[PDB]
Ligand binder design. Structure first.
Ligand SMILES: Nc1nc2c(ncn2[C@@H]2O[C@H](CO)[C@@H](O)[C@H]2OP(=O)(O)O)c(=O)[nH]1
Ligand SMILES: [Ca+2]
Length: 104
């Protein structure tokens, strides 16, 4: 079973932790990757009830299991905060335009 399911993509807690560590590492170094500059602030326009405090940052999580290193970020994102706490896993899949929904 998936710990997080973003559309058709299935993620385990281990996939999420691995992606989160990568994103957070770049964040503490003031570094960014990809044409879209990841990680970057996640504004929470959707107003998800993250139990973890802001500010929030998003980083891509890939269905291939690889850690994001530039190139196509796909539609899935791990969201974490300043304390390296997981806020949630979200996706653009199944959401109109640039909106996002949570992975269930
Ligand atoms: N849907 C959504 N996108 C956000 C938010 N904060 C940052 N973004 C990013 O801003 C872009 C334009 O709104 C989005 O496509 C998304 O980038 P990602 O593609 O990196 O997820 C947010 O709170 N909601
Ligand atoms: Ca996996």
């Amino acid at each position: 079973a998936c710990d997080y399911t973003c559309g058709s993509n299935c993620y385990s807690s281990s996939d999420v932790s691995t992606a989160q560590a990568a994103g957070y590492k770049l964040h503490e170094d003031g570094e960014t990757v990809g044409s879209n500059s990841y990680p970057h602030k996640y504004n929470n326009y959707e107003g998800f009830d993250f139990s973890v405090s802001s500010p929030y940052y998003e980083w891509p999580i890939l269905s291939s299991g690889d850690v994001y290193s530039g190139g196509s970020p796909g539609a899935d994102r791990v969201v974490f905060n300043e304390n390296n706490q997981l806020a949630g896993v979200i996706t653009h899949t199944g959401a109109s335009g640039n909106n996002a929904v949570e992975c269930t």
